[PDB]
Amino acid sequence: SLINFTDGFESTGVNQQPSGWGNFVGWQSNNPNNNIGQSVYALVDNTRAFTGNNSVHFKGGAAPAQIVRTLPAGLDKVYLKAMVYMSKKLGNEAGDNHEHIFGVRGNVAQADNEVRFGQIKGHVGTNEMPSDDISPPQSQWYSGPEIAADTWHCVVVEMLGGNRPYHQLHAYLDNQLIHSIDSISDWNNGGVNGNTQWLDGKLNYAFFGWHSFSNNNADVWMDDIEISDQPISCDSRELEH
Amino acid sequence: SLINFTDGFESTGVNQQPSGWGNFVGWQSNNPNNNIGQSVYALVDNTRAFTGNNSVHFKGGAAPAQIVRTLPAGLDKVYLKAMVYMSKKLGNEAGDNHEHIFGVRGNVAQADNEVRFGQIKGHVGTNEMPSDDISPPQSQWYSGPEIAADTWHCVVVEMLGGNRPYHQLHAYLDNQLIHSIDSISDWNNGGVNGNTQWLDGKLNYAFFGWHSFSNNNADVWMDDIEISDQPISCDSRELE
Ligand SMILES: [Ca+2]
Ligand SMILES: [Ca+2]
Ligand SMILES: [Mg+2]
Ligand SMILES: [Mg+2]
Ligand SMILES: [Mg+2]
Ligand SMILES: [Mg+2]
């Protein structure tokens, strides 16, 4: 196991970029103007949190607001996990293009080569660049499970790459499966241009934040972020029974 | 006096970025992957032109496709002019957010500090960043003169900065005035946060291409670009 990382943001000052992360803010990797005087930012906030005093607050829209972690070389799989609290919903949303909260990217400079989880065409799901292909197919658009605004959610994304006949992704909300990609028919536009191994070269950086391709501004808070190459799950506290 | 530049793209090979220019492609300055293999690019094209063999061809959308050039230190005003041919129109367009063809920017790496001329809220006009203000005001949105698709146009933008009480911008189509920013009431949202000197710091680079904030893909061709600190207008051949 090459990575087993957790961050509750408790050690960073309020209004500062999380210590130990990079950023991708307003389309620039490690934007030097990620601060409280800007309209788009990714900063520690002590006004909402799932555990302890602090979370990370993403304020963005069309312009992305993200924190970025470098992943170890040669991962075949990765698990991204966080407590997530959003100003708006994902899923079952008319007129959506696509929006995402979680992802991985191959090149730090670009949003050009990456896998993007949140919603596509108003269903919870995934956009890949550079194909710009989307999952699920048209059939399911503007429907399906909702990730509600204004409440804390335990979101896990499992990405299974490496030496397997078709690369997979499964997303879970409070430990319930909500979205899967496990064959080529799950994509709308012919399956990432025929490519069965569609996570190859994607697993270099992990990112978290807000990025709307539907022209929607949002405020998103996350806490207790985890990144691992072994499965991650949510505890009863996180499930909020 | 400080700049008098022209480019018809005739010396650059087809499918190559225009010689002597930088780029802003896919939100990256001097993107190394500005080439005919990509879905977003700014490349010389000999299949359409206004004069000679060649034009520059911008293919982009929400992801920008632009060529960029430095401007000399000290400019207090600039004129941007080009023959322009576009796959869609600007102006009189319901549902538009904003889209632009011409601009100037302060910092090469970002689209974060710049004046954007094309349409705002479906009326020919201007967006400034970082204020995100727009002109004209809301009374005129989704109306006004059209810059039509599928035909060659001569577009000129005058930007008047430096030591004057209020910075100004005037845009012209085939020598007819189509848009003006003369005073603070021309802005929708309070006038660039009350800054009268709103061109200051903006005249470091000129840029041209296609950049939509309305999620519209386009192809745009330009030729016979001029950039000067002295006025420019369209000649007899350009008016057609
Ligand atoms: Ca915390
Ligand atoms: Ca030419
Ligand atoms: Mg919950
Ligand atoms: Mg845990
Ligand atoms: Mg004409
Ligand atoms: Mg001339």
Residue numbers in the entry:
A (entry chain A): 3 to 243
B (entry chain B): 3 to 242
Copy the relevant paper text.
We therefore set out to characterize two previously unstudied proteins from the shipworm symbiont Teredinibacter turnerae that were initially identified by the presence of carbohydrate binding domains appended to uncharacterized domains with probable redox functions. One of these was TERTU_3803, which contained both a CBM10 and a CBM2 domain attached to a range of distinct modules (via flexible linkers) that did not bare any sequence similarity with catalytic domains typically found within carbohydrate-active enzymes. Using a ‘module walking’ approach, we searched for other genes coding for these X-domains. This led to the identification of TERTU_2913, which lacks CBMs but contains predicted X122, X183 and X132 domains. Taken together, these sequence analyses suggested that TERTU_3803 and TERTU_2913 could have a role to play in cellulose metabolism, and furthermore that role is likely to be a redox one given the presence of cytochrome domains within their linear amino acid sequences.
In addition to our work on Ttpf08450-X173, we produced TtX122A and TtX122B, representing the X122 domains from TERTU_3803 and TERTU_2913, respectively. The electron density was readily interpretable allowing two molecules of TtX122A to be modelled in the asymmetric unit without breaks in the chain representing residues 3 to 244 of the protein coded for in our construct. Three molecules of TtX122B were present in the asymmetric unit, with chain B’s electron density most readily traced allowing modelling of residues 2 to 235 without breaks in the chain. Chains A and C had some areas that displayed more disorder, so there were breaks in the model between residues 190 and 192 in chain A and residues 162 and 165 in chain C. In addition to protein and water molecules, two magnesium ions were modelled into the electron density on each protomer in TtX122A based on coordination geometry and bond lengths [Fig. S4(a)]; these ions presumably bound from the crystallization medium. To check the oligomeric state of our TtX122 structures, PISA analysis was performed, which revealed that there were no significant molecular interfaces between protomers in the crystal for either structure, suggesting that the molecules would be expected to be monomeric in solution. Our subsequent structural analysis therefore focused on single protomers from each structure. The overall structures of TtX122A and TtX122B reveal that these domains adopt a β-jelly-roll fold [Figs. 4(a) and 4(b)].
